[PDB]
Amino acid sequence: DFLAEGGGVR
Amino acid sequence: SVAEVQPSVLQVVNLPLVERPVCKASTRIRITDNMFCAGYKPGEGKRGDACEGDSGGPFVMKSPYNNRWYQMGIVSWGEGCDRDGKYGFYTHVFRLKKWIQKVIDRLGS
């Protein structure tokens, strides 16, 4: 999970 | 038309290529050879980053060899904008170059 770990699409 | 937070005109920023081990260490995410990170390190004083709405845009370089611009990356993601200790992640175009030529040279190349 990219999202769970802080990652933000731009 | 405009309003602060959103530019009225095209914006530009020049940012340095950050070494891989640094990029890899700046995030809990699973980095890949298919992405590179760029941006200023905290001990540098200069700032700048891509931000929400910059996605899909180009990350170019100008060859000192022949004076042409090359597209090295594409704005992908980051963790907030311009945060100390964090870098912007970009798609590594040269690495996905085979696929690009496959689809342009009609599913063959």
Binding site: - | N14, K62, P64
Partner: protein, 36 residues
């Protein structure tokens, strides 16, 4: 592949084709040199 594909690509009509440099291009040149 090698070098240029269009002949023309990356050569800006308003700049490199008019022997003119943009305000911040010097910043990139400066970052170079056989430096890295």
């Amino acid at each position: 592949t090698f070098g240029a594909g269009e002949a023309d690509c990356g050569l800006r009509p308003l700049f490199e084709k008019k022997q003119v440099q943009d305000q911040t291009e010097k910043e990139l040149f400066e970052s170079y040199i056989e430096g890295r």
